[PDB]
Design a protein around this ligand. Sequence first.
Ligand code: FMN
Ligand code: F3S
Lengths: 116, 1468
Amino acid sequence: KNGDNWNSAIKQVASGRFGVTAEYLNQCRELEIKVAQGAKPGEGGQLPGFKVTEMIARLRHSTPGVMLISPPPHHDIYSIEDLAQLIYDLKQINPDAKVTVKLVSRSGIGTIAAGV
Amino acid sequence: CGVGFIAAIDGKPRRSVVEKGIEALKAVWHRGAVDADGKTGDGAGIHVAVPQKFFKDHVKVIGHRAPDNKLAVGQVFLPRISLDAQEACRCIVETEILAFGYYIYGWRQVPINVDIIGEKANATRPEIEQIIVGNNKGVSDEQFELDLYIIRRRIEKAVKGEQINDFYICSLSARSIIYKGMFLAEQLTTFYPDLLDERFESDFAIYHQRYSTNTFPTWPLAQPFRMLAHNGEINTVKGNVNWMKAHETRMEHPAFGTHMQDLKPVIGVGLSDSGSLDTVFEVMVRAGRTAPMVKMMLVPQALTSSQTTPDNHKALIQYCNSVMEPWDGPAALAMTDGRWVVGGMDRNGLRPMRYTITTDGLIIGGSETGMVKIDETQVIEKGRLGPGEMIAVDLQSGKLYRDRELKDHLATLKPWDKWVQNTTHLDELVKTASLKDMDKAELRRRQQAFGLTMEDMELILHPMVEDGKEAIGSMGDDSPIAVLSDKYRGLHHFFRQNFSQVTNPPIDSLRERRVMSLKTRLGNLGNILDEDETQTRLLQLESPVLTTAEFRAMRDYMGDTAAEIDATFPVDGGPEALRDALRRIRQETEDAVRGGATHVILTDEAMGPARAAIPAILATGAVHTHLIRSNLRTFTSLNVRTAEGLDTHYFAVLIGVGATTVNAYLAQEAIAERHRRGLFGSMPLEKGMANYKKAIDDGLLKIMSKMGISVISSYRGGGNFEAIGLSRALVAEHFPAMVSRISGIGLNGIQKKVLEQHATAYNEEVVALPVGGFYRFRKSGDRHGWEGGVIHTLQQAVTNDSYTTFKKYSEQVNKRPPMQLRDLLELRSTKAPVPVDEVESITAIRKRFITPGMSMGALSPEAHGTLNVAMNRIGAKSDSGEGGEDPARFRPDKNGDNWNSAIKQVASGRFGVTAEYLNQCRELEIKVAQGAKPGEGGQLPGFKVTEMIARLRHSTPGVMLISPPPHHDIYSIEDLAQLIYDLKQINPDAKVTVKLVSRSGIGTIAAGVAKANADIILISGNSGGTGASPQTSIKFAGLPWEMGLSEVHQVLTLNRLRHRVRLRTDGGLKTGRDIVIAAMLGAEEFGIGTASLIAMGCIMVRQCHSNTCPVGVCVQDDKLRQKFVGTPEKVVNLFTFLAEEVREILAGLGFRSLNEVIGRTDLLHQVSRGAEHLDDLDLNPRLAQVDPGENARYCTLQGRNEVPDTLDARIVADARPLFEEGEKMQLAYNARNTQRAIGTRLSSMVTRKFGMFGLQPGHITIRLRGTAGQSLGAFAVQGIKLEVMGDANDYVGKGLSGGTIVVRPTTSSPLETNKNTIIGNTVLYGATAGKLFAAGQAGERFAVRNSGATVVVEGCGSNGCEYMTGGTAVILGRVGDNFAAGMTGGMAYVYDLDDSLPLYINDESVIFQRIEVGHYESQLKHLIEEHVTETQSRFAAEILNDWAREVTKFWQVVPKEMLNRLEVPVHL
Ligand SMILES: Cc1cc2nc3c(=O)[nH]c(=O)nc-3n(C[C@H](O)[C@H](O)[C@H](O)COP(=O)(O)O)c2cc1C
Ligand code: F3S
């Protein structure tokens, strides 16, 4: 009511697919795809046991007080063709948003850049 | 437009100064007008020192040997068309230079670039050359400059003496040089490539960029002049040039020598006002005086009778005003000598000026602050200039003198207190002389001799001596003009007063009487180029009106030195008695003057049954003009008696023509007679005489302030009038420079009428005075325009739908004898008639009609609503008026009507003006004046302000409301272009229409307004009604609208601007023939006005100013409002009938539509009255037809005229998420001075979206870096917040309604907050609600007409909180002069450290005291807490720390009207 916009303008599609939902993908302007980040490029994001509250369980559709660790590989990205298919899917489900990949700087990234 | 000066304090030549000057020139394009092509401007110029090394190297390159003494350079514009004229001009210059024996080094042709100048300013481009002269005789510099000045005068004279036009010496000296032209101000440095060389170095630079009012340019009329650079306009130019012509005969000095006989015509011919000002300035400087002294003597400071000024400056000002008469008007001067550089203001403080000091000893002054860029880490003092202030720099000693220090250094030269002590003010003289009768028969005889009536006499005389004020009319005058009458009318009916509309504003009289002077000096004229206490040995009077007692005292004083002259002529003389009488009195007074008599007394006590009296106006004019033409007026002070003077207009016109004092003895005789019969009651004779004298003085002050003049010493002999209905020969022979565009009766008719009246008076034994019918109607005589029969016939025709009755009404209206100018005309055509059906549809001409607005405070809201309903039903456009409008009227009706308007007025009061109120409309209207009162403004009596109008106007109930005459934000055409910019910014779908009043010379203002991006002009005649106005204003002002309309159309077509602006006239239209004639003259839209009122109940009772109008139209009480009998069907039928008659007459003419006739004057002809024998009124110039060329005479483009975009656009694209979702936003930008009206378009958008108060405060915030332009936050609604870091220019916070503005120096400022200026003038003009927190000294006219806003400022200027009505203002520190004058509602809190407030404040309607109630203490505490939280000012925190000790230092200012109506008692 006070002109406060609490929504998030960029949404993420990570390797966990915790809160992804048909309604969650239309409240945005740009969607982002997560491959790896600068701290844990291989093992994916993790969340401790005593952190997840009941609200976290409702957000992530899970059991309260359990250790949640995201699977390292995107189970639907096993090759670059899978990446193209996933971008097709995302652009189909959202008719007006943009897609974005997220890489980590390493040698031999040129071919990956050209592919994406 | 703008002037500016950059000076170095040390006094060393350098390049950075010229660099800064050119940079300042390059950023002023926003103020000056724009063109269509972008290659022509109004004129620009720079004035710098002479680069000695540059020309020395040039001469060395030529081949000569450069000497060591200085080298003078002179710039000349030679004619370019021919070739042999250039040769003769060079020969003239060389033969007048080589006379003094100097040596010439040669000429030079400055290279210029001729692709920048547009084609218009190129057809009159002169050939620019320079001449280099050198001193081989070896004289000092002062003699050198004096000789060069004398050489320039001699050259100008010898060239003028040969009719060699277009030859101008711009500047010839060895210290200064001038580079001026007609190019754009920006391209200066790319037009004169000489200025690009880095070898030009100076220590002072003065730049000017003017603002023209004519499409045809002229090079020599482009500022700056030799010793001056003026911004504004000088009103008193005619009186000043006349008195200069008088003084030209006895001014001499041993410095010049025989060459003084060359400089007799000190003022040339064909120069503008600033030109004459500059030439007199240069003379008085070269004579030996210094620059500050002559600045004081030409335009002095207002001699206040207060204890704010010590006696030193008081005696100085007395001497200055004793030497020379002032030059009133708005003027911000930036002049320079060879030694001093002075900036100064006028008496009132209208134009703006701001200066800044750097750390490296450099001072930069100009009109706006952001014109030059300086880092914040180098400013030392940002100042301003109040009324009459001045700041100077001395280059020889290298010092900077501010106001008080310079005033002291001036007043410490000569013993001014002793010199001023040799005067004599005639009060103790009459007091000690007081220690040392006419029968009623001859009294009535003479009263009938001079045509005085009885009822019209007491109706205007008894209210003068009863309370001390003047009468009040209630409706527009339709009496015949001075020449079309058949009864006797004195000469004063033939002179209409003047006024200023746009070029310069009028002056208020009730709240600015401190700055007006009515002093009169006798025996004071002398050598202005001499300085000795002999000049302060004269006679002083407080007012030029004298009763018989003081007149006898002065007569006994003068005694034998007077020379009394007759003013009578034999009645039995031949057909040429008046001319011989004039010649006789002329020779008599001239011989008396040559006889050493220093006084002339015009008296006509020799009237009897055998000799008639000459109208004193004519005698005074003849004597004055003859004493001027015989080089003798400088000797004798003219003294005049009369037997007719009764009203203020008579005394005004009698003093304006040359007289010094007027004594009306017969009126005092009549007053004493009326007292001896016991009519006033218990009032003594002396009290009545005092009231009468006060009334005459106030009338004179009103007539002076009508046109922006504050000194009677400069109005005398000015000829600021217009004679309508007189021959050209007589008005050019026996009167000063005036204007009479149409001719009139000559000497024969005057004598005939005088003799006939005298025969009716004395030959027959008249026993009682007639009843008279001038003001009111009577059956005896004095025919009018509206009559009983006509009113009844109109009412019947409109109430019975009988078109035949309307035809009979029109026939009755047209058959009357000629009562107006157009009645002397007759339309004709040679084509064949056409069946009536082919004429365009009735609705097509019905849509060309409007109804001029009337304020809601004047007439009852029922009639206003009826007009609006009828107009919104028929399809035409109505007007809301001046008193705002009801908000709930913004919704349609269930029956198909709408109680809204289509045109909103933005007057000089700004009552209900709000960002919303300017949105529900189509055509904004900016009222400047009207026909019933040109220079008074709208007024509303006391008891007509009920609670409804109180909640509408945000005012106090039961108290009078008189709007200020001048627009506090329109002081010149520059501010008017600015205001039109703001108004077109706030509303995207409106066309801004200006209103005008007919007068002489309106063409210049017309062309200016056309160039100022206006859309619709509106010319009004003198026959417009009102709700309340003085009688002199109604009967003795304005001209018929035909003359003005013809003039404005011809001027707009001449400059090829007519196709860019429509035209519209109003005032006294009843029939169809007048509409067709108005269409023929050039009008396109017509307003009917009061006629509609008569079709609604008004039957010309003329009691609207008493709130008891019988039928119930102009009323504000319950009982009379219920007697309303109006109906919109009446107005519908009225407009239907008008369109029907127009259709019929246009069919009879031989055309088919209105587009075929607009702009044609070759269809009119003139028929005269041979039996009247009067000199045929030469209406020929009113039929002057100029060929339009290719653009049609009526043509106009579709839609409003475009306008450039400001920063607001960049916001509305980056804030679109706000207009689509409604969320908080914070934006940041850099703000230059060129950007104007930052943040108004967003205000309009949010007003359309959420309304006035739809968003909570601070819903969207904007930060601005640098220097904001003019009109910051104009009409910002609640929810917007603006915060600027730096300084604002002017007009900041205008029209604020709910918004929030914050100004503050940036965080790195080394300055002191409460010791510098941060904003401009007229801050918060007519705001309604919101807040304004600042840190610094404001400007003059701070928070005028404020009502509801809350403002907190640290120190302000003069006229603070003037005319306030509500809200709260918290001032910290020193306040200006004349503070809280005329305040009516609200409250003020001042912080005084020296208890100086009781000396500056105005005790008219405010009381100042100490704070006692804890409630107000807590309120002020909260306000200061909020202010210091917002801007983090250190002074506010320091106050809040020591609050328990500062609660006593505060003073409270409370209006005299809210003493009991307030909830909490302000006094315990
Ligand atoms: C009673 C009355 C009140 C008026 N009030 C205003 C006013 O408040 N502001 C204004 O600009 N003109 C005012 N006018 C002038 C009209 O707008 C219009 O110019 C004038 O009445 C037309 O002249 P007319 O009487 O011949 O029709 C008023 C006129 C009358 C008769
Ligand atoms: S004189 Fe005025 S008050 Fe009404 S009756 Fe006529 S309009």
